[PDB]
Symmetry: D2
Subunit: 194 residues, 4 copies
């Protein structure tokens, strides 16, 4: 139910898995057997990131293997966000907005799902600044106006115009950048990273 | 480059993996060693689904392990669909349309990605017919009007109203159904199964 | 068949519905009638060729593997045993005998072997090019001379009885018995 | 530390950027200053407690594991060896001795053991409740009496030297040496 109960359980499981008793694990970590027992009784909440790294190391695993998954924030399998709930970040250069990011619903049950409405306020394709690609795949859909999309190698990009209603898939690790089509003022798209 | 070259390569790999020569594999399948060799030389294109099932069985694996992945239809990591390319299926009951499905971009590199614009033509929540849930997760976003969403157990559903701009996540295997809000005529949403 | 065609029948239907194609839509793309597509979804797809399956998977934007069922279940309440008398052998030809241990469709990548290592000249060790998966090894009898990495300048280890080893996916490796000791035996578990 | 804090630093930044939060946004949600969040992303997060990490992961809609680096690499060009003299032991207490074979951070679920089985009374076999992963077993010495499934009415097998077995994830099982044969030995590979 918490980081430390989650840890207590996963710690005990791993330790038993590798056939160590409290004393063996304690001897590897500069603690008493009693202290290791306390962790497994849910008293590990004040362990530091550094100490957790050492525990994972001596158990031949990662901190992730010893900590609980993200958790469940769903309501019988669903989560809903109303339109006046959306968080917003602005893409700014020299106190000029280039993008506004309208954050749509997210869930701990699918952490890589990041959907956004992007207001695209630059209509100078020169302004497009390449990222370096995502860990995951991405789906885009043009809601308003027309997008000038660039992808691949920032030095010699591939480019395309996407009118309203166009849809696109960008594979993991593919660098990309976009603005509105030259001189057309502004555009809007939905981007779903997953 | 084809089903049969893909198979030829995967067949040889598996057979070598389990330490069988052509003769051993041939003796399990009612063929000569030469025939099995021919398959590995790319001559398996006329093998039936049934015969493939038997080959997979005797090799202790699945037909999928012996056939190539979906393939690559991307253009330097991307695929784009223009708005007048979209395929359409209609949800019809007694020659009355309830839904129109406007199929957005798909790719063999991520087969479970199925994005749709759904025109919702029924505004009677009684008309909502539950599916039985998806293999994958689903993201929804209301583009026009207002949606009456139902989910969970069809006998005692959970329900919510989603106005324009609302967004929603439905976990794998969660049954759901939707119409437009009662009496409001019609609505439109984007649904991204992934 | 029953399982392949019945499994194909169910997954075909699921996938078709998933991409919002009715029988008529799918049938047209394949040059078939809707009744033919219906017949496949009724379990009558057993005579479809590998090439035809490739085209169905293509039009459905997916793979043959996605439209076909997993390997079956050959376990007896979660377990499968192999008795020592029941091992298949393949004799890296004449100087290694491969005694195949238990395998299961529920974990097709698991391939455990007892390898009889009959060469004791490390100079003749022949490097493979690496496995697709990891490997665990345990020296059962004798003493093994293991080589790995770059065949031109390999890492090496002399491994007495009871030694154990892990070889990561794609790492080239070779073994012989230790120079002049005759023969050795290991258990190799590819997983 | 270096690796945990440096790894946290990089993944924190990636995730923050991914969900479109600047330092100030993240800092406010955590009751911290933006300079503090900047300091973490500069490798100064080593003293963060398990509880504080839980809250950072919570606000970022993810897990601690997603914000922390994988287990390191302890391999020598793709390989790790363990010599027979180097086995850790745990003595299912007094009648099983567990001799730990080679393990690696590159495959943390791989736990191979030599199990010395010192009880030869099948009546006393104690059932575990099943593993999280699969298991491969090979009878090294003697003869094993294996039980599995329902402890109330188990499936059983007498397994002579050289027998091999696969036990699927979550299947309860127990073993002793065969009645009155004294002792036995197997290699168990959990993977
Ligand atoms: Hg945000
Ligand atoms: Hg935002
Ligand atoms: Hg369609
Ligand atoms: Hg469609
Ligand atoms: Hg074999
Ligand atoms: Hg064999
Ligand atoms: Hg141990
Ligand atoms: Hg041990
Ligand atoms: Zn992107
Ligand atoms: Zn759905
Ligand atoms: Zn090998
Ligand atoms: Zn076990």
């Amino acid at each position: 139910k918490t980081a430390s109960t989650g840890f207590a359980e996963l710690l005990k499981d791993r330790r038993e898995q590798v056939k160590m008793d409290h004393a063996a694990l304690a001897s590897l970590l500069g603690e008493t057997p009693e202290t290791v027992a306390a962790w497994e009784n849910g008293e590990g909440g004040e362990l530091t990131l550094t100490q957790l790294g050492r525990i994972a190391h001596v158990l031949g695993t990662s901190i992730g293997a010893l900590t609980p998954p993200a958790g469940n924030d769903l309501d019988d399998g669903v989560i809903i966000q109303m339109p006046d709930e959306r968080p917003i970040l602005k893409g700014v250069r020299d106190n000029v907005d280039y993008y506004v990011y309208n954050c749509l619903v997210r869930t701990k049950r699918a952490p890589s799902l990041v959907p956004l409405v992007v207001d695209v306020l630059t209509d100078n394709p020169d302004d497009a600044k390449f990222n370096s690609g995502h860990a995951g795949n991405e789906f885009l859909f043009v809601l308003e106006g027309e997008i000038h999309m660039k992808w691949g190698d920032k030095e010699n990009p591939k480019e395309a115009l996407l009118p309203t209603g166009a849809s696109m898939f960008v594979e993991e690790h593919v660098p990309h950048a976009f603005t509105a089509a030259k001189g057309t003022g502004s555009a809007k798209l939905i981007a779903v990273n997953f």
